[PDB]
Design a binder for these strands. Structure first.
Ligand SMILES: [Mg+2]
Ligand SMILES: [Mg+2]
Ligand SMILES: [Mg+2]
Ligand SMILES: [Mg+2]
Ligand SMILES: [Mg+2]
Ligand SMILES: [Mg+2]
Ligand SMILES: [Mg+2]
Ligand SMILES: [Mg+2]
Ligand SMILES: [Mg+2]
Ligand SMILES: [Mg+2]
Ligand SMILES: [Mg+2]
Ligand SMILES: [Mg+2]
Ligand SMILES: [Mg+2]
Ligand SMILES: [Mg+2]
Ligand SMILES: [Mg+2]
Ligand SMILES: [Mg+2]
Ligand SMILES: [Zn+2]
Lengths: 53, 69, 96, 106
RNA sequence: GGGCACCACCAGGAGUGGAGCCUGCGGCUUAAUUUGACUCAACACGGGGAAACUCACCAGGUCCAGACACAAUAAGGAUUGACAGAUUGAGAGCUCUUUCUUGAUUUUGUGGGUGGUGGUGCAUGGCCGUUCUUAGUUGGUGGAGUGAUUUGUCUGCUUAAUUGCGAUAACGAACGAGACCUUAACCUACUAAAUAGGGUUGCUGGCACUUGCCGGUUGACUCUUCUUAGAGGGACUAUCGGUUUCAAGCCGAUGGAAGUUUGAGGCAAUAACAGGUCUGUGAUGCCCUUAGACGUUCUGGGCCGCACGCGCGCUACACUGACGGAGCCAGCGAGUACAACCUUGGCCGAGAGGUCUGGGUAAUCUUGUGAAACUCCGUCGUGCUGGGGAUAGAGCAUUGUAAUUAUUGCUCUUCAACGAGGAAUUCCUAGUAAGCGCAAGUCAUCAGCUUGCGUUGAUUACGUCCCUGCCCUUUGUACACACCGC
């Protein structure tokens, strides 16, 4: 309802949230994942990413 | 943690000074009505002007007048 | 909570039509998908509903999910007017 | 009556490799059955998606890493064949996992 | 006593420690210069290259996002809104000036939640690190003990390995190691291709001018060596020689793409640590807080300050160079349609960078990423010199809302310290070391960082327990919260 409740958050750390936590910390934005790295690690196997070498 | 600063002066949201059956409008005869101040040109009748010293506005269009009356 | 009641009504109607509701966890968003109201408002409404039973809520992956219980459905109907043999998603429309 | 050859490339992209191979084989068999002019299953370079990530959450202890990776397998089957035939092919030979896809326009 | 290891040392290399500068961390400073973590296992770590955001800190302001329960107003308004200038950092109705809107949402209380980059990792989960990638661990019988326990699990010799051979109240087993997996190497043997490369030939450019040489064109036809990447093989220490109770194995020649576990990793036991993380987490106990918040959110700073310590790092102390030309070759990658990605090709600009145009959702276009270090001919010749490039001043650019507390780039100018660095100490055994650049990661903009990549490519061992650590065995023990012990 108030007028000024928004700085321009188009880009940077503030704009890019993650899908799961909604954090701005260790954000894997490679290949359009948008996942905080820990979260990715936790799920990587389900998202097709496996450790080989 | 660090202690809070304490200047002192607090400001609260105003309670508004509510008033109803306001002294706007009148009737003299009984049958017909006599409007006081004036209605809005932009919006339809039913809404009424705010009257000040050569300064007007209305609330349905938040506040958008300029000309006197 | 401070809702222009029309918007709320619209939201309710939408919910009824659905038998379901999916929202973001995104406050500051100017307008929701489908409904022409603020997402935040919708979320608030949903929360309120949950607080008085009715709706079941899940907060997974920045997406609030919402489904109506029988009681909730009844309440919605009451709010609306619509009597009986109506939409939601408690039963199929025809063959699908 | 028609016999209008549009020249149609079937793409075949996947992660699971054996499955993809099987699919390709099936496609080839189908082609043989239908007896058409086609270039055999061309195999493109396996694009690997690498995500390097510090194993830690908190970045405390030794500085260990995990290269998580994804294998992409991309195959092409170029058919010098009609539209109807292509449609038929699309209809039969669909497996789970493999991304069957058609270009259609030479 | 006996093992093992370039996180040990030898024999050597490269170094760091000195110099300047980057960046971490102290200390001081500061409103605040947010916090976590300090032997290896803190200190270019938090993917932590902070311009706001991030952000937790400070100065200031805004907002409820106080779910729900129950009463006080319940329209003679609950509370919602509100242009105009003073107000206000301020086109924050932040309000006090105002007298118009708003219609029961609310709101005033009382139960009751909710949020918190608040606290406590010595309340926890999960994950990670470390003991340890070391070689260790276990139980079923059977034997020794009343018993805790023990033997098996070991004198020796082997091995990277509790790896094996052997000797044997132990026998056969499991886990760990190995096997396994992925990748790095071989395939003129298969299956394949105008999104990979060639051969003949058409047209076509130039040459010598005979037939021949280099080309350019997706014009035709055909091939799969290189390419990819499917299926397979291929190495098993193979053959031979010694050596060793003629065992395990090891050592040398031959062949072989490969003979260091073929190279490199991925995983990786039992038991743990009061190691780290409650600042990844709608992982969370409890406490605190809880509507002028320690919630949120704006605005301006701050993490970057400097008498000074250490820690990763870069740049150099030049002649194996510097500077000019010229030659000119990689591999990992990555890259947009709801955005604004990589961006060739053309013109403008000394540059940076602008512009028009494309091509690319990608073996197709960027891209042969014609990367550097290198190689060739010339200019300075061993002088704090043209080595070295710091601090500096100015302007030109770009990113963004915002560039001063230079973001970064470029242009001219300034030319400081430093003639190979003491005590100390790091890393290393082969395509390694070191050099060299690229590459993505973070990223609107910033690389001295990082994970990878290839290019150039050595010196010296191929041993030992001297040091250091660790492991066992035998010993001793007033220790068991276990030497930071008693
Ligand atoms: Mg405060
Ligand atoms: Mg260690
Ligand atoms: Mg810093
Ligand atoms: Mg480092
Ligand atoms: Mg910065
Ligand atoms: Mg939080
Ligand atoms: Mg918390
Ligand atoms: Mg702990
Ligand atoms: Mg602790
Ligand atoms: Mg027994
Ligand atoms: Mg024992
Ligand atoms: Mg022999
Ligand atoms: Mg190996
Ligand atoms: Mg290419
Ligand atoms: Mg000079
Ligand atoms: Mg960095
Ligand atoms: Zn009006």
């Amino acid at each position: 309802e108030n007028v000024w409740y928004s700085h321009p958050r188009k880009f940077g750390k503030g704009s890019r949230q993650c899908r799961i936590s909604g954090s701005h910390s260790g954000l894997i934005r490679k290949y359009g994942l948008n996942i905080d790295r820990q979260s990715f690690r936790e799920k990587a196997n389900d998202i097709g990413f496996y450790k080989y070498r | 943690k660090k202690v809070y600063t304490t200047p002192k002066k607090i400001r609260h949201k105003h309670k508004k000074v509510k008033l109803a059956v306001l002294n706007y409008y009148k009737v003299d005869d009984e049958g017909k009505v006599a409007k006081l101040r004036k209605e809005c040109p932009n919006c339809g009748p039913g809404i009424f002007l705010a009257n000040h010293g050569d300064r007007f506005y209305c609330g349905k269009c938040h506040s958008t007048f300029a000309t006197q009356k | 909570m401070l809702i222009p009641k029309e918007d709320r009504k619209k939201i309710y109607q939408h919910l009824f039509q659905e038998g379901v509701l999916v929202a973001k966890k995104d406050f500051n968003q100017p307008k929701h998908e489908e409904i022409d109201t603020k997402n935040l408002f919708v979320i608030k409404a949903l929360q309120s509903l949950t607080s008085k039973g009715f709706v079941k809520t899940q907060f997974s992956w920045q997406y609030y999910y919402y489904t109506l219980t029988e009681e909730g459905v009844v309440y919605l109907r009451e709010y609306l007017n619509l009597p009986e043999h109506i939409f939601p998603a408690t039963y199929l429309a025809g063959q699908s | 009556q028609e016999v209008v050859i549009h020249k149609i490339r079937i793409n075949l992209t996947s992660t699971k490799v054996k499955q993809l191979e099987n699919v390709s084989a099936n496609i080839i068999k189908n082609a043989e059955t239908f007896k058409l002019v086609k270039k055999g299953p061309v195999r493109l370079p396996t694009k690997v998606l690498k995500i390097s990530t510090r194993k830690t959450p908190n970045g405390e202890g030794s500085k260990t890493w995990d290269t998580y990776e994804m294998r992409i397998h991309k195959r092409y089957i170029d058919l010098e064949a009609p539209a109807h035939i292509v449609k038929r092919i699309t209809q039969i030979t669909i497996e789970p996992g493999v991304d069957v896809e058609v270009i259609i326009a030479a």
